[PDB]
Amino acid sequence: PDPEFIGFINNVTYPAGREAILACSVRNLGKNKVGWLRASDQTVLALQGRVVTHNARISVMHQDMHTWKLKISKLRESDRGCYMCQINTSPMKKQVGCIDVQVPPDIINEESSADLAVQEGEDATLTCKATGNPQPRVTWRREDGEMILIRKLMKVESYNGSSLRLLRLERRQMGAYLCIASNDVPPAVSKRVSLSVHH
Amino acid sequence: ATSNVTTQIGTHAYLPCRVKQLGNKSVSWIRLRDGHILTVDRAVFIADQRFLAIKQPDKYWTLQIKYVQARDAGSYECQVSTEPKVSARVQLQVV
Ligand SMILES: *[C@@H]1O[C@H](CO[C@@H]2O[C@@H](C)[C@@H](O)[C@@H](O)[C@@H]2O)[C@@H](O[C@@H]2O[C@H](CO)[C@@H](O[C@@H]3O[C@H](CO)[C@@H](O)[C@H](O)[C@@H]3O)[C@H](O)[C@H]2NC(C)=O)[C@H](O)[C@H]1NC(C)=O
């Protein structure tokens, strides 16, 4: 009779480079048909057992008459999002499966501080811009282990933020600063930025 | 072409696909309000048989909606199955 879904599409979380499979199960499909739509950019992916998109990483598979599979190989971060399995009943029936594509942190040297020099008592902002999914946290600490000095100024052994803002610099504050970028997706990364303070 | 098509209730609407078909890629129509897949090439997915995809020799496609009703008004999108897609919208106005 009227086709219906068996369970719900299971949602997946993979690092980039892995393969994602979304299974859409239907009972009594009859003469109806199953289509796939990528929801983020409303792109038709497949219709029945045929792939529509010329994206060569995406395919569809059908063995058990009830289960319709969407496969995305070598997951890219832009594949993240939800995927609609449509049954052409009237009114339409649909389920959605979602892909979380995790990306490990990466610090961009172009948009991040290189070794810099400042005159004593001047200001100096160190900055590490980071990419990743989830968006990576950025932590600033001194390689030698001394506490950084920022407004309460006060002594902290770590600062969370992309831009470490140092002002009224004194001679003690010269040396190597680490910015660590992490998002619980391994591996965390760090950039080593060296600050020199002239008299 | 045009992104605004006006059609009297009860007459056939012809929605231009304002994007050119490239090579052997497919041409598909979707309804934007619900994401409902309508046509893929000449295959009609939606059960409503007033919907028809017309393939022209010069690679410019058309979505025909026979006997337009008020409920048909809204935005439609033509898309060519490159990755990323090439797409163009059409507002159908019913009068
Ligand atoms: C995979 O994820 C989908 C989607 O989940 C939701 O949307 C995402 C964008 C995220 O924001 C998620 O955090 C968010 O929860 C799950 O689908 C949802 O499943 C529930 C079932 O618990 C659906 O609710 C029901 O709908 C049925 C009919 O379909 C009714 O009979 C029930 O009474 C109940 O209302 C809900 O509609 C559905 N949402 C969508 C958009 O599809 C899905 O369950 C999940 N997969 C698994 C295996 O958990």
Author numbering:
A (entry chain B): 37 to 188, 194 to 240
B (entry chain A): 123 to 217
Could you give the paper's own sentences about this structure?
We have recently identified interactions between two groups of Drosophila IgSF (immunoglobulin superfamily) cell adhesion molecules with properties closely matching a neuronal chemoaffinity function: 21 Dpr proteins, named after the founding member Defective proboscis extension response, selectively bind nine proteins, now called the Dpr-interacting proteins, or DIPs. All 21 Dprs and nine DIPs are predicted to contain two and three immunoglobulin (IG) domains, respectively. Our previous work identified the first IG domains, termed IG1, as the domains mediating the Dpr–DIP interaction by the formation of a pseudo-symmetric IG1-IG1 heterocomplex using the GFCC’C’ face of the immunoglobulin fold. Therefore, Dprs and DIPs are strong candidates for a synapse specification or targeting function.
We crystallized and solved the structures of Dpr1 IG1 with DIP-η IG1, and Dpr11 IG1 with DIP-γ IG1 +2. Interestingly, while the pairwise sequence identities among the three Dpr–DIP pairs are comparable (49% to 56%), the Dpr11–DIP-γ structure is significantly different than the other two. When the interface residues at the Dpr subunits are superimposed, the three DIP subunits are slightly displaced, with DIP-γ (dark gray in Figure 3) more distant from the other DIPs (~1.2 Å at the interface and up to 3 Å at the back face of the IG domain, Figure 3a; see Figure 3—figure supplement 1b for details of the displacement at the interface). Hence, different Dpr–DIP complexes can be established not only through shape complementarity between Dpr and DIP surfaces, but also by small but significant movements of the Dpr and DIP monomers with respect to each other, a mechanism not commonly recognized for related interaction pairs. A second highly variable position, Leu154 in Dpr11 (Lys in Dpr1 and His in Dpr6) also fails to explain specificity via simple electrostatic or hydrophobic matching: The interfacing residue in the three DIPs is a glutamine or lysine (Gln78 of DIP-γ), which is pushed away by the hydrophobic Leu154 of Dpr1, but not in complexes with Dpr6 or 11. This movement of Gln78 in DIP-γ is then accommodated by a glycine in Dpr11 position 157, which is otherwise a bulkier and hydrophobic Leu and Ile in Dpr1 and 6. Therefore, the Dpr11–DIP-γ crystal structure enables us to see that Leu154 and Gly157 in Dpr11 are structurally linked and are needed for DIP-γ binding. Interestingly, the position equivalent to Gly157 of Dpr11 (and Dpr15) in the two other DIP-γ binders, Dprs 16 and 17, are larger but polar amino acids, which can still be accommodated at the site as hydrogen bond participants with Q78 in DIP-γ. However, in Dpr11–DIP-γ, for which our structure unexpectedly shows no hydrogen bond, the His-to-Ala mutation abolished binding by more than five-fold. The A165Y mutation is expected to create of a hydrogen bond absent in the Dpr11–DIP-γ complex but present in Dpr6–DIP-α and the engineered Dpr11 A165Y F167Y K207V–DIP-α complex.
